[PDB]
């Protein structure tokens, strides 16, 4: 257990707790000196706000940390406006994970084409063409998303994957004319 | 009794219920539906189902039949319009049909009989969402089509087992959708500036105790959103010229990339002053993230914006009419969301108001169906 001195308007407030915590568990000891529901505690620690969610020890906190208490009366419309990009970072990564799903299916077509060709079979034209085209509709559905960061990353691996089953599809065409 | 407007590209359905018309979803909860007829070596394929394997399809997929509706082989824009469709046309006795393969057959029909099958979409659409058949029907047409086109027009919809009340012009149904004809008194004129579905049409009224006379018509067959899609596409093939010394323009891929990134912009921009443009590796590897300006979107389609204020005027002369006799000007059409096509056409009257609040692709099928209900 450690100590952190949350300060509260001139008061100053010692409370008693395990680094492990998550600043979600110090709000909630909070609400008991200070009565402000937790949801309603902004905290700061070095001069950053921290979020409920990330962890004392890991952000540095150490026996005899000083924060700040902050109440914020419109939390509830911050509450609403975090989740509201946390559903639209989900929505977007979900989507291309569903393509990539797709994509798995179709290189799985890829793979066999090429398979058959090692193998002396021979693959129609038509065959070829078609898987082409499922392909290229994957990548305008990936072009389709917005994404930063992971998500975009995540996005630009998928649109790599659909351009090398392509080119493997089109080195097959020009074999077979 | 419904209402349908039947597109060159797309065909929107209503139908009037409980005092009011409700615009009608169709299976994919879309309010409008594609006007395309796609033929495969298995089935049939109409609607969303025929647009969306186009590009694994294309010279099986039949569109823009309303081109071709009451025209002659001969007429020199068939033969002009025939080396841009991919799927072909063929001379029968004069009469141009479109020729496609159908179950492993060479199989041809009528402008009418695809027509037909848009209407018979359209139709099902409307039961579907009933739960009871559906028999009959107004269905629109432009005002410039002669009594040649109005029947065909017709005959589609008796094929699709629909009896036509009556076909009425695109601009009166829009009118009728706005209550234009019970702004009851002197007779008032009225100017529809229909920009959308491939086609820019401004058609000039008059009312009188809710009689519709149409005074004049103008415009351009062949200007719509896509000239506008065009411009950013070659501004934005320039822009990559400039960056990265390659010219994207011969790869195909890149190019359909590139145009459907640049019809969301479009959009983006009709609401928002920027738009984001972000297409990974888009040629050779090269990522492409960019964005683009209302104002630079503007600037870009300049001239064909303002250029749609030459058959506004050709239609006020036609019509032995000043600008400021227009009772009641009219925007219908998805291009007309374009606010600096709002502006131009409110500047170049003055000032006053335009009637917009109903949603421009569906303004239309809107007054075919009040229409259809008081025809029943």
Known sequence: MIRVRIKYGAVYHEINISPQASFGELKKMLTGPTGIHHQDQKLMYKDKERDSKAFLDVSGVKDKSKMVLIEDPLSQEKRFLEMRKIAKTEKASKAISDISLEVDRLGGRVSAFEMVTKKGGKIAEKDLVTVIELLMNELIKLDAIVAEGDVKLQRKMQVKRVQNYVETLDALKVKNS | ?376
Request: a neutral charge.
């Open chain 2, 1 to 376: 009794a419904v209402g349908i407007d039947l597109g060159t590209t797309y065909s929107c359905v209503g139908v009037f219920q409980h005092g009011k018309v409700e615009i009608i979803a169709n299976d994919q909860g879309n309010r409008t539906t594609p006007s395309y007829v796609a033929f495969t070596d298995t089935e049939r394929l109409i609607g969303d189902a025929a647009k969306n394997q186009v590009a694994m399809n294309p010279t099986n997929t039949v569109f823009d039949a309303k081109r071709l509706i009451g025209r002659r082989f001969d007429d020199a824009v068939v033969q002009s319009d025939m080396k841009h469709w991919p799927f072909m046309v063929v001379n029968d006795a004069g009469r141009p049909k479109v020729q496609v393969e159908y179950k492993g057959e060479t199989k041809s029909f009528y402008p009418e009989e695809v027509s037909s099958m848009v209407l018979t979409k359209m139709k099902e659409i409307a039961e579907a969402y009933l739960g009871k058949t559906v028999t009959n029907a107004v269905v629109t047409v432009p005002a410039y089509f002669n009594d040649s086109q109005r029947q065909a027009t017709k005959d589609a919809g008796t094929i699709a087992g629909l009896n036509v009340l009556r076909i009425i012009n695109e601009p009166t149904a829009a009118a009728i959708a706005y209550g234009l004809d019970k702004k009851v008194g002197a007779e008032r004129n009225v100017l529809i500036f229909d920009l959308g579905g491939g086609t820019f049409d401004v058609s000039i009224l008059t009312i009188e105790d809710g009689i519709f006379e149409v005074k004049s018509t103008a415009g351009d067959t062949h200007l719509g959103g896509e000239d506008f899609d065009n411009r950013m596409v070659n501004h934005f093939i320039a822009e990559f010229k400039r960056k990265h010394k390659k010219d994207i323009s011969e790869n195909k891929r890149a190019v359909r990339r590139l145009r459907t990134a640049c019809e969301r912009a479009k959009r983006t921009l009709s609401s928002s002053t920027q738009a984001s443009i972000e297409i990974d590796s888009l040629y050779e590897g090269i990522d492409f993230y960019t964005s683009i300006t209302r104002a630079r979107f503007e600037e870009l389609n300049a001239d064909l914006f303002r250029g749609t204020l030459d058959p506004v005027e050709k239609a006020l002369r036609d019509a032995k009419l000043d600008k400021s006799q227009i009772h009641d000007i009219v925007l219908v059409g998805g291009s007309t969301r374009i606010p600096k096509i709002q502006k131009l056409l409110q500047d170049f009257f003055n000032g006053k108001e335009l009637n917009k609040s109903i949603n421009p692709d569906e303004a239309v099928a809107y007054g075919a169906a009040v229409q259809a209900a008081i025809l029943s």
